[PDB]
Design a protein around this ligand. Structure first.
Ligand code: CA
Ligand code: CA
Ligand code: CA
Ligand code: CA
Ligand code: CA
Length: 415
């Protein structure tokens, strides 16, 4: 029932998101025994974050922000009210049952309603991009698949094809990317990175180095289904040298899973081997580096890299810059960052995509589309702590229009 919660403000943000009612015209009913006016709800909570430690739970409906009634206010109004707190955020929330918050309340009627409103926006004179963005950036990827299916049923046209002709520019890129499943999107981004004469090494490295075993297994399956060739064969065709060997190894998605016991002796031996193979000698034993950094689990390699500082005068990143160059150096640097702190890795990539002249939209869009909402909260925390202002703020300065609005929705809030 109506419960009050106080959340401390910090340079890590509040660690939670609010969004509008997904089941706008249907499943909006009495929450936890009492019917109410339309309210925003907590769509995601960062575990261990300030909202989680204060008692905020996924699905909680928001009633008051700092003592002010927010019933019926727009998403931008609540974000402004939450931002208007000098040192604290006080909320009046309402818990909902778990099945009313895990996604299973989304029905085929909601999917058909979303598809109807998207068809309306497409057919509206001049195209209603605002409505299309409002829906698709505030649905889960699974719900977007239901919307696409329902859209095809009612129009006998594919939603992706219809939106491709209705939209243009970077907004088209965002929307079409959101419509694919995670494995489909990564597989098509990988295919695009190897299309044409050159190779987009930056994109190939970013995807291959940052995806987990489970994500890569599904990417390998879907890539084969979509393009009738194995991802590994396309990588082998497009790359060469040690850079090829590293990419092929990582793409297999067969890294050791996190074990139950910390292997301290192997941590020390891997550190020695990394030092003996690089800084300690003339040249580099690249195969030794590749085998250790592709095969060992992420928590193991985190401890290996710290133990490495006991043997080497330079840390792992600086050793890489001193030992290798080119695509191989770029790949190792990205991989070590992903191992050491993946949310910080994406925060730095986002900052790099916007910090200078113009925007590296290809990188900015891919990160905002591909990251889960909770992972984006991890990224927003690292970003705000490192750079002083929010990811929201930098997106605001570098992009404009409906394209900006789509990215800010994917960001999910200000910090
Ligand atoms: Ca328009
Ligand atoms: Ca177009
Ligand atoms: Ca090529
Ligand atoms: Ca050396
Ligand atoms: Ca810029």
């Amino acid at each position: 029932g109506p419960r009050v919660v106080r959340i401390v403000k910090s340079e890590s943000g509040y660690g939670f998101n609010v969004r509008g009612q997904v089941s706008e015209g249907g499943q909006l009913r009495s929450i936890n025994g009492e019917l109410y006016a339309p309210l925003q709800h907590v769509s995601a909570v960062l575990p261990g974050g300030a909202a989680d430690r204060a008692g905020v739970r996924k699905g909680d409906r928001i009633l008051e922000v700092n003592h002010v009634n927010v019933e019926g206010a727009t998403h931008k109004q609540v974000v402004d009210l939450i931002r208007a707190g000098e040192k604290e955020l006080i909320l009046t929330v309402l818990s909902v049952p778990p099945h009313e918050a895990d996604g299973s309340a989304y029905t085929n009627f909601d999917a058909e309603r979303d598809a109807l409103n998207i068809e309306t926006a497409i057919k509206t004179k001049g195209v209603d991009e605002v409505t299309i963005v409002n829906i698709l950036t505030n649905r889960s990827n699974e719900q977007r698949q239901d919307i696409a299916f329902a859209y095809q049923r009612r129009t006998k046209k594919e939603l992706a094809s219809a939106l491709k002709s209705a939209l243009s520019g970077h907004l088209e890129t965002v929307i079409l990317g959101l419509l694919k499943t995670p494995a489909q999107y990564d597989a098509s981004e990988l295919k695009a990175s190897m299309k044409g004469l050159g190779t987009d090494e930056d994109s190939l490295i970013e995807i291959i180095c940052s995806r987990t075993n489970q994500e890569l297994q599904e990417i390998n399956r879907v890539y084969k289904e979509m393009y009738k060739t194995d991802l590994e064969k396309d990588i082998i065709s497009d790359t060469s040298g040690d850079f090829r060997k590293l990419m092929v190894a990582l793409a297999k998605g067969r890294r050791a899973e996190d074990g139950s016991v910390i292997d301290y002796e192997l941590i020390d031996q891997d550190a020695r081997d990394l030092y003996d193979a690089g800084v300690k000698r003339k040249g580099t034993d690249v195969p030794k580096w590749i085998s250790i950094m592709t095969e060992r689990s992420v928590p193991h390699l985190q401890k290996v890299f710290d133990r490495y500082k006991s043997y080497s005068p330079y840390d792992m990143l600086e050793s890489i810059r001193k030992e290798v160059k080119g695509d191989l150096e770029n790949a190792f640097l990205n991989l070590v960052q992903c191992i050491q702190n993946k949310p910080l890795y994406f925060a730095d990539r986002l900052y790099d995509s916007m910090k200078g002249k113009g925007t590296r939209d290809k990188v900015l869009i891919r990160i905002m589309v591909s990251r889960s909402e909770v992972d984006m909260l991890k990224i927003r925390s690292e970003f705000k702590r490192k750079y002083g202002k929010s990811l929201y703020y930098y997106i605001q300065q570098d992009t404009k229009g409906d394209y900006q609005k789509a990215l800010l929705y994917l960001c999910g809030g200000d910090d």
